[PDB]
Design a protein around this nucleic acid. Structure first.
Lengths: 60, 128, 99, 98, 143, 204, 82
RNA sequence: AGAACCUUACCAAAUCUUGACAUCCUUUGACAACUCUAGAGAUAGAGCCUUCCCCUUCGGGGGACAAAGUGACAGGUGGUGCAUGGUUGUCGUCAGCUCGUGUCGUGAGAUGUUGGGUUAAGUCCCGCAACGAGCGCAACCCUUAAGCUUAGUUGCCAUCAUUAAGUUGGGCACUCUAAGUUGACUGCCGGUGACAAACCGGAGGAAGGUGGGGAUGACGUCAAAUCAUCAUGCCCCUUAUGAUUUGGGCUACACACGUGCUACAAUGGACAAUACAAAGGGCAGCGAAACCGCGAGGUCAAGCAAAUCCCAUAAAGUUGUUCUCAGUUCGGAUUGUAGUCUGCAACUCGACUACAUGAAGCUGGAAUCGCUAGUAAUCGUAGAUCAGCAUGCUACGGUGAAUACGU
């Protein structure tokens, strides 16, 4: 399961790249951003929070 | 001398119509209308403002212009002209507005949304 | 000889009224201030789906806003310096004092 | 039809049975564009034998389901439904004058 | 509900060329359509040389119908055409037959078609015929 | 659709951001810095029952101000707690703080306070509905223009999921000038999870 | 391709260093995906761990339309009936 | 919203067990870098330098530690989306959906929410044992079309002088630029209309009939979906149903389904010259020019956290030349050869460049799908996901029509 993988993406490496930038709060690796390091959905939750500015919304 | 002037707006194409008494002649961007705008043999329609206003004519022209393609960019010409003709004489507004060309077309492109792909086609349904 | 600055916050009221704060404290002890020369104030985009497992086509969008303000002042002197670093608040602005 | 089985492994025995049955509908009319079958063991824990079936038709289609003790009873009970769900349709019968 | 008019033709001061370049205007490419059509006004005005409107107007009064039909149980009614639909369909079979010669040129197939059609021949005068053989054959049970 | 708390639809117009600092692209550091505080407040949730806190970050300092209904608790008698909170915080923030509690007025009208309130009377073996009866009762009392209050899960410690809500007071929701304070809660005892979704309307 | 150029894991080559001067061996077990043939490996055997079990491949003369990383693709019969 | 390892959940082997990792209690401690040996690594065997740094009155307290013990425990991508929360599609952006009071009625129940008109709409008005209120539509908000003001750099050049070049001087006048203004509200009029509700028409106006779109999606159905987002009721495991390493695999193919992409050609293919956008990325990333090269790329290095500099040059098109209707210069799969970039590593399984080779295929049968105007259709552009990598997704523009009788 992901519980040891938590350490995997935190462990050291033989070399540069066998790594990934998963989410912090969630552990979903896929569908993430290098801007905030958050999965697809925590961003949604905390965009509704308006925690960060943030904007949101619907001007496009 | 004197010279009239106006602004032009459509289709992401902007023009600062500079309209002066003269022969009736164009060098857009210091370059003629004809070879510049492909192809194009449509410039009667660009002179139809003269076909209806102070007809025949003529007044020479200057204009700086950028943005979009020839369609809007040739079509961004007129409303600065016709507006400069309101500024010339509002009398012909009755001859303009009954014929358009001082009404800037408010229409433009749309946005995207889920459904669109490479060709602007929304999806099929489940046949079989 | 001039002074210049750059501002970046994500509310259009507070940032320009704050410009009036520092500008007021500036032409207090100076003058020759360029008014709030606007800037294009571009944006961003961030798209996320309303889902967890499936249903990709039905989604949602977000963005970011990014205001910039160009303000300057001429014939400098140490008084307008203190007007610069005197009153920037609220601190959502990102002042960059320069010359 | 994606004859898929949730928590039950479709054998050839089951496929043979199924397709065999729908062959009987060549009475009307087959015309075989496609057909599907959803089968599942949903624990109650008396626990099932669920059958849901889909028929795409000419200019229309007709879904059909049913639950029962076992797979064969579910296929036989769901039968005599997707026949009367089909029969009749037409005729319809001519006019106008005037 | 209106039909989004085209102003004049800027070539010879007609109009229906404009209505017609747009029917050659495939892919939204106008210049190639305009190109090949006006070229056809070179070719047809050359061969048996004459005005545009002799061969054109005549030919599009040799194929341009007067009665059409519509279905409604199913009973096909003969109907009087609205002149926009008349001219519309004339040009429809014009281009939509123009490809159907099966030839090489941009224009010969066109100028062959309008020349032939000015002479009351070819598949466009034909569809006028057969169409008006559905008209007055089908007067009886639906008019 | 189907629905969203309007706060996401109301924010950017009619309310502050829930956390604040200067606008630089070092967000992964600073956002996940904020969160380390946002976690720790739950220790005080069991002691404070605060609504929320929005942080400012001055040019070299931090300001937070906690929206509580338990001032003397969190202040203590003479600040015997706030200062070791500065240092136990500053220990973890790796940077200092200037806390300044922002006490709640009007007073126990708020959504979050009432939300976990009724969740907790429910957690103490209560027929659920009466809690909402007294809730709305003291709600229109304190002066409010629109309320409902929803609940989900295995109610009464029994069989499969249910729901309920008592709507009273006209609640403009599909508007865009409502300025209303949505909330949520989560608390079970033995059977699953029974959150709630309270609503209010006070002013515009 | 490679950045000018051919390579080896620098333990396998360090092994056949000890294998190759003396009376050679007909036996090497390995894992050998990040290493490939070249004329020092000649005269020896290898057995690359396919993913389940190594299997012998003796280095022949012009094994140059071929390499070390694979000799019996682990799709393994086939994967397909035909 | 990126499977060579990683990811990966799956498989092999090499492996460990208070464990991969976390807290507590006990023993200490600043926490270990560079190599050697073996190992495939994991890792060990060692050498070795981690070495109480804040406080200490002699000790201790303490941020943080070593390996061990310590039993709880840890952990479970083990199961249950019909034990659930949360979150989301759905019919449906349809026009409806309820209640307090009262009446009626044995009673369930109806009334309001019905009849007439009217609107896109429970929109309004009238009449009415009904009256009032709620949610819902509109409205409120964002964007867009016009103008006014505010301010002029990195933006513009109108008068100019000037540079190859708005390059320099100067001016913000213009366009541009971001915030408050005025504006369109059947509002003004005419008509039709139970005069009301309204509807038809006209004037102006930039915009006349909720200007266009965006957001917002009622009660609720689908025992809809998700225990693998997160959390979690219950069950189960616990020297393994847990956890570590090197390799494989998640991509195999007689085949079928869906979805897209590319060809079946002269409205065109090959080649030379030439005009036009929008948006947006950039810190050690964007790599200007120059230089090398058949090109992928390689060298160099100016500038630049951007109205600047760079990314980056638009394609369709326009001008011509040729090809002259072939399975053709259509066609562009196939396979090999020789190379570039990245990666420790491009064989199962990265892309791309140069050379050759040239499959099927001449508009697709029955059947079947979308779309009402800048729409369709077509040609481009950037962005994320990123070491590498999009016929996909999102966003941007360019060009750009046919039809709409009537129901």
């Amino acid at each position: 399961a992901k519980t040891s993988m938590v350490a995997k993406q935190q462990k050291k490496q033989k070399y540069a790249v066998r790594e990934y930038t998963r989410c912090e709060r969630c552990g979903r690796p896929h569908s993430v951003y290098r801007k905030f390091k958050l999965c697809r959905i925590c961003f949604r939750e905390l965009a509704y929070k308006g925690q960060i500015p943030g904007v949101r919304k619907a001007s496009w | 001398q004197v010279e009239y002037r106006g602004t032009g707006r459509r289709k992401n194409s902007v023009a600062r119509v500079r309209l002066v008494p003269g022969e009736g002649n164009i060098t857009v961007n210091n370059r003629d209308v004809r070879e510049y705008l492909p192809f194009e043999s449509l410039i009667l329609d660009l002179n139809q403002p003269f076909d209806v206003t102070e007809t025949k004519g003529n007044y020479d022209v200057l204009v700086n212009v950028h943005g979009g393609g020839f369609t809007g960019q040739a079509q961004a010409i007129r409303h600065g002209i016709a507006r400069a003709l309101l500024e010339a004489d509002p009398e012909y507004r009755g001859s303009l507005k009954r014929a358009g060309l001082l009404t800037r077309d408010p229409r433009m492109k749309e946005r995207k949304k889920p459904g669109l792909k490479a060709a602007r086609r929304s999806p099929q349904f489940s046949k079989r | 000889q001039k002074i210049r600055i750059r501002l970046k916050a994500y509310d259009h009221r507070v940032i320009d009224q704050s410009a009036e704060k520092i500008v007021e404290t500036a032409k207090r002890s100076g003058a020759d201030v360029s008014g709030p020369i606007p800037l294009p104030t571009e944006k961003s985009v961030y798209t996320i789906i309303r889902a967890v497992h499936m249903y990709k086509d039905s989604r949602e969008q977000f963005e970011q806003r990014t205001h910039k303000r160009l303000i300057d002042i001429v014939n400098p002197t140490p008084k307008t310096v203190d007007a610069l670093m005197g009153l920037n608040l609220p601190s959502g602005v990102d002042i960059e004092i320069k010359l | 039809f994606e004859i898929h089985g949730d928590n039950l492994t479709i054998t050839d025995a089951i496929r043979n049975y199924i397709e065999e049955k729908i062959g009987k509908l060549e009475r009307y009319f087959n015309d075989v564009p496609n057909a599907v079958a959803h089968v599942k063991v949903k624990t109650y824990s008396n626990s099932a034998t669920k059958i849901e079936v889909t028929i795409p038709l000419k200019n229309v289609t007709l879904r059909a389901e049913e639950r029962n003790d076992d797979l064969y009873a579910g296929i036989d009970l769901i039968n005599n439904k997707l026949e009367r769900q089909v029969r009749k349709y037409k005729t319809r019968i001519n006019r106008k004058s005037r | 509900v209106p039909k989004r008019d085209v102003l004049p033709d800027p070539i010879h001061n007609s109009k229906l060329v404009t209505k017609l370049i747009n029917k050659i205007m495939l892919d939204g490419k106008r210049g190639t359509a305009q190109r090949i059509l006006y070229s056809a006004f070179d070719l047809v005005e050359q061969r048996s040389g004459r005005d545009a409107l002799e061969v054109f107007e005549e030919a599009i009064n040799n194929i341009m119908p007067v009665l059409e039909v519509k279905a409604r149980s199913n009973y096909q009614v003969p109907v009087e055409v609205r002149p926009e639909r008349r001219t519309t369909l004339g040009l429809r079979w014009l281009v939509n037959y123009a490809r159907l010669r099966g030839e090489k040129t941009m224009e010969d197939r066109l100028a062959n078609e309008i020349l032939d059609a000015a002479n009351n021949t070819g598949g466009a005068v034909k569809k006028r015929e057969d169409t008006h053989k559905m008209a007055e054959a089908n007067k009886a049970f639906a008019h | 659709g189907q629905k969203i708390n309007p706060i996401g639809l109301r924010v950017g117009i009619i309310r502050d951001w829930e956390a604040k600092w200067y606008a630089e692209k070092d967000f992964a550091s600073l956002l996940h810095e904020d969160l380390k505080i946002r976690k720790f407040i739950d220790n005080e949730l069991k002691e404070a029952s605060v609504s929320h806190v929005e942080i400012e970050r001055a040019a070299n300092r931090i300001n937070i101000a906690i929206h509580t209904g338990k001032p003397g608790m969190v202040i203590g008698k003479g600040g015997s707690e706030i200062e070791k909170l500065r240092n136990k915080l500053n220990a973890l923030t790796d940077k200092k703080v200037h806390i300044n509690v922002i006490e709640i007025k009007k007073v126990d009208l708020d959504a979050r306070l009432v939300a976990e309130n009724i969740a907790r009377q429910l957690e103490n073996r209560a027929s659920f509905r009466r809690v909402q009866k007294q809730a709305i009762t003291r709600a229109m009392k304190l002066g409010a223009k629109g309320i409902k209050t929803q609940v989900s899960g295995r109610l009464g410690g029994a069989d499969i999921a249910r729901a309920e809500q008592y709507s009273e007071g006209t609640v403009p929701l599909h508007t865009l000038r409502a300025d209303i304070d949505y909330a949520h809660a989560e608390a079970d005892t033995t059977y699953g999870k029974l959150g709630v979704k309270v609503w209010i309307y006070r002013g515009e | 391709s490679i950045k000018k150029g051919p390579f080896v894991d620098e333990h396998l080559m360090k092994k056949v260093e000890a294998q190759e001067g003396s009376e050679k061996k007909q036996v090497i077990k390995t894992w050998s995906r990040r290493s490939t043939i070249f004329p020092n490996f000649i005269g020896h055997t290898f057995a690359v761990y396919d993913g389940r079990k190594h299997v012998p491949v003796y280095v022949t003369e012009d094994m140059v339309g071929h390499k070390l990383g694979e000799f019996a693709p682990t799709r393994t019969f086939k994967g397909h009936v035909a």
